[PDB]
Design a protein around this ligand. Structure first.
Ligand SMILES: NC(=O)c1ccc[n+]([C@@H]2O[C@H](COP(=O)([O-])OP(=O)(O)OC[C@H]3O[C@@H](n4cnc5c(N)ncnc54)[C@H](OP(=O)(O)O)[C@@H]3O)[C@@H](O)[C@H]2O)c1
Ligand SMILES: CCCCNC(=N)N=C(N)N
Ligand SMILES: [Ca+2]
Ligand code: NA
Length: 159
Protein backbone atom coordinates (compact mmCIF):
# COMPACT_ATOMS: atom_id res chain seq x y z
CA UNK A 1 0.00 0.00 0.00
CA UNK A 2 0.88 3.68 0.26
CA UNK A 3 2.45 4.95 3.48
CA UNK A 4 3.48 8.42 4.64
CA UNK A 5 6.51 8.95 6.88
CA UNK A 6 7.06 12.34 8.53
CA UNK A 7 8.55 14.11 11.55
CA UNK A 8 6.22 16.63 13.19
CA UNK A 9 6.91 19.33 15.75
CA UNK A 10 3.93 20.63 17.73
CA UNK A 11 1.02 21.97 15.68
CA UNK A 12 2.03 19.39 13.04
CA UNK A 13 4.87 21.61 11.79
CA UNK A 14 7.10 19.76 9.32
CA UNK A 15 9.05 22.44 7.46
CA UNK A 16 10.37 25.98 7.33
CA UNK A 17 12.66 28.14 5.17
CA UNK A 18 15.83 27.33 7.12
CA UNK A 19 17.23 24.13 8.59
CA UNK A 20 15.20 22.72 11.45
CA UNK A 21 16.48 23.74 14.95
CA UNK A 22 17.05 20.22 16.24
CA UNK A 23 19.42 17.27 16.00
CA UNK A 24 17.62 13.90 16.01
CA UNK A 25 19.81 11.05 14.76
CA UNK A 26 17.32 8.62 16.32
CA UNK A 27 14.68 9.93 13.90
CA UNK A 28 17.05 9.41 10.97
CA UNK A 29 17.65 5.81 12.07
CA UNK A 30 13.88 5.28 12.31
CA UNK A 31 13.40 6.76 8.85
CA UNK A 32 16.02 4.40 7.40
CA UNK A 33 14.63 1.36 9.22
CA UNK A 34 11.20 1.94 7.69
CA UNK A 35 12.23 2.95 4.15
CA UNK A 36 15.10 0.54 3.40
CA UNK A 37 14.92 -0.78 -0.17
CA UNK A 38 11.46 0.65 -0.75
CA UNK A 39 10.55 3.23 -3.41
CA UNK A 40 10.34 6.75 -2.01
CA UNK A 41 8.16 9.53 -3.45
CA UNK A 42 9.04 13.13 -2.64
CA UNK A 43 8.29 16.61 -3.85
CA UNK A 44 10.85 18.72 -5.64
CA UNK A 45 11.58 20.89 -2.60
CA UNK A 46 12.19 17.85 -0.42
CA UNK A 47 14.52 16.55 -3.14
CA UNK A 48 16.48 19.82 -3.07
CA UNK A 49 16.81 19.56 0.73
CA UNK A 50 18.51 16.16 0.38
CA UNK A 51 20.66 16.91 -2.67
CA UNK A 52 21.47 13.29 -3.51
CA UNK A 53 19.58 10.02 -4.04
CA UNK A 54 18.63 7.95 -1.04
CA UNK A 55 20.69 4.76 -1.47
CA UNK A 56 19.33 1.37 -2.43
CA UNK A 57 15.89 2.66 -3.42
CA UNK A 58 13.96 3.98 -6.36
CA UNK A 59 13.82 7.75 -5.80
CA UNK A 60 10.75 9.32 -7.43
CA UNK A 61 10.56 13.14 -7.56
CA UNK A 62 7.38 15.04 -8.31
CA UNK A 63 7.83 18.23 -10.33
CA UNK A 64 5.79 20.05 -12.94
CA UNK A 65 9.05 20.81 -14.79
CA UNK A 66 11.65 18.58 -16.47
CA UNK A 67 14.01 16.80 -14.13
CA UNK A 68 17.46 18.17 -13.36
CA UNK A 69 19.22 15.04 -12.06
CA UNK A 70 19.18 11.84 -14.10
CA UNK A 71 20.20 9.75 -11.07
CA UNK A 72 16.55 9.74 -9.93
CA UNK A 73 13.14 9.34 -11.55
CA UNK A 74 11.08 12.46 -12.26
CA UNK A 75 7.30 12.45 -12.68
CA UNK A 76 4.72 15.14 -13.36
CA UNK A 77 1.64 13.75 -11.57
CA UNK A 78 0.53 11.64 -8.63
CA UNK A 79 -0.59 8.89 -11.01
CA UNK A 80 2.82 8.86 -12.70
CA UNK A 81 4.54 8.74 -9.30
CA UNK A 82 2.53 5.67 -8.29
CA UNK A 83 3.13 4.01 -11.67
CA UNK A 84 6.88 4.61 -11.36
CA UNK A 85 6.87 2.59 -8.12
CA UNK A 86 5.63 -0.50 -9.95
CA UNK A 87 4.44 -3.59 -8.09
CA UNK A 88 5.88 -3.32 -4.57
CA UNK A 89 4.68 -4.18 -1.06
CA UNK A 90 4.90 -0.60 0.21
CA UNK A 91 5.37 2.85 -1.31
CA UNK A 92 6.94 5.38 1.07
CA UNK A 93 5.92 9.03 0.69
CA UNK A 94 8.63 11.08 2.40
CA UNK A 95 7.46 14.69 1.97
CA UNK A 96 6.82 17.50 1.82
CA UNK A 97 3.57 19.17 2.82
CA UNK A 98 2.10 19.53 -0.66
CA UNK A 99 2.90 15.90 -1.45
CA UNK A 100 1.57 14.61 1.89
CA UNK A 101 -1.72 16.45 1.27
CA UNK A 102 -2.26 14.63 -2.03
CA UNK A 103 -1.25 11.17 -0.83
CA UNK A 104 -2.93 11.13 2.60
CA UNK A 105 -6.37 10.15 1.22
CA UNK A 106 -4.64 7.25 -0.57
CA UNK A 107 -2.54 6.13 2.40
CA UNK A 108 -3.10 3.08 4.59
CA UNK A 109 -0.28 3.75 7.07
CA UNK A 110 1.39 6.72 8.75
CA UNK A 111 4.85 6.56 10.33
CA UNK A 112 5.06 9.64 12.55
CA UNK A 113 7.79 11.07 14.73
CA UNK A 114 6.37 13.54 17.24
CA UNK A 115 9.05 15.97 18.39
CA UNK A 116 8.65 17.90 21.66
CA UNK A 117 9.65 21.16 20.02
CA UNK A 118 7.76 24.35 19.20
CA UNK A 119 9.14 25.78 15.95
CA UNK A 120 7.82 28.46 13.63
CA UNK A 121 7.16 26.74 10.32
CA UNK A 122 5.52 27.38 6.98
CA UNK A 123 4.54 23.78 6.21
CA UNK A 124 2.38 21.37 8.21
CA UNK A 125 1.46 17.72 8.02
CA UNK A 126 -2.12 17.44 6.71
CA UNK A 127 -4.96 17.18 9.18
CA UNK A 128 -6.05 13.69 10.17
CA UNK A 129 -8.40 12.34 12.83
CA UNK A 130 -6.63 9.83 15.13
CA UNK A 131 -9.99 8.06 15.53
CA UNK A 132 -9.87 7.07 11.85
CA UNK A 133 -6.62 5.19 12.56
CA UNK A 134 -5.39 2.41 14.82
CA UNK A 135 -2.10 2.85 16.66
CA UNK A 136 -0.18 -0.37 16.02
CA UNK A 137 3.17 0.77 17.47
CA UNK A 138 4.23 3.55 19.83
CA UNK A 139 7.39 4.37 21.76
CA UNK A 140 8.42 7.49 23.70
CA UNK A 141 12.05 8.58 24.07
CA UNK A 142 13.83 11.23 26.12
CA UNK A 143 16.37 13.66 24.76
CA UNK A 144 19.93 12.48 25.28
CA UNK A 145 23.53 13.30 24.43
CA UNK A 146 22.81 12.63 20.74
CA UNK A 147 19.20 13.89 20.42
CA UNK A 148 18.34 17.49 21.23
CA UNK A 149 14.64 16.99 22.05
CA UNK A 150 12.38 14.25 23.33
CA UNK A 151 10.32 12.50 20.68
CA UNK A 152 7.99 9.57 20.11
CA UNK A 153 7.44 7.22 17.20
CA UNK A 154 4.04 5.92 16.20
CA UNK A 155 2.69 3.79 13.37
CA UNK A 156 -0.97 4.32 12.52
CA UNK A 157 -2.94 1.99 10.24
CA UNK A 158 -6.09 3.28 8.60
CA UNK A 159 -9.20 1.90 10.24
C1 LIG B 1 8.46 23.29 0.98
O1 LIG B 1 7.13 23.07 0.52
P1 LIG B 1 6.58 21.56 0.51
O2 LIG B 1 7.06 20.81 1.76
O3 LIG B 1 5.08 21.56 0.21
O4 LIG B 1 7.33 20.99 -0.78
P2 LIG B 1 7.39 19.50 -1.38
O5 LIG B 1 6.07 18.77 -1.16
O6 LIG B 1 8.71 18.85 -0.99
O7 LIG B 1 7.55 19.86 -2.92
C2 LIG B 1 6.51 20.55 -3.61
C3 LIG B 1 6.84 20.53 -5.08
O8 LIG B 1 6.63 19.19 -5.60
C4 LIG B 1 6.09 19.28 -6.91
N1 LIG B 1 4.76 18.68 -6.91
C5 LIG B 1 3.93 18.40 -5.85
N2 LIG B 1 2.80 17.84 -6.21
C6 LIG B 1 2.90 17.72 -7.59
C7 LIG B 1 2.03 17.20 -8.57
N3 LIG B 1 0.84 16.68 -8.30
N4 LIG B 1 2.44 17.25 -9.86
C8 LIG B 1 3.64 17.77 -10.13
N5 LIG B 1 4.54 18.28 -9.29
C9 LIG B 1 4.10 18.23 -8.03
C10 LIG B 1 6.14 20.74 -7.31
O9 LIG B 1 7.42 20.98 -7.88
P3 LIG B 1 7.64 22.12 -8.97
O10 LIG B 1 7.63 23.42 -8.22
O11 LIG B 1 8.99 21.78 -9.54
O12 LIG B 1 6.54 22.01 -9.99
C11 LIG B 1 5.96 21.41 -5.95
O13 LIG B 1 6.38 22.77 -5.92
C1 LIG C 1 15.10 12.49 4.02
C2 LIG C 1 14.33 12.71 5.33
C3 LIG C 1 12.81 12.66 5.18
N1 LIG C 1 12.25 12.22 6.47
C4 LIG C 1 10.97 11.89 6.74
N2 LIG C 1 10.05 11.99 5.77
N3 LIG C 1 10.54 11.43 7.92
C5 LIG C 1 11.21 11.54 9.06
N4 LIG C 1 12.15 12.48 9.34
N5 LIG C 1 10.94 10.66 10.03
CA1 LIG D 1 11.92 24.10 3.66
NA1 NA E 1 7.27 -2.69 8.19
Amino acid sequence: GISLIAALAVDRVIGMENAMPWNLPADLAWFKRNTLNKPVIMGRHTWESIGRPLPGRKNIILSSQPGTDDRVTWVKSVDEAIAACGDVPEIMVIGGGRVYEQFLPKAQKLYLTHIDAEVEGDTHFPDYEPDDWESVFSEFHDADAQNSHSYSFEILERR
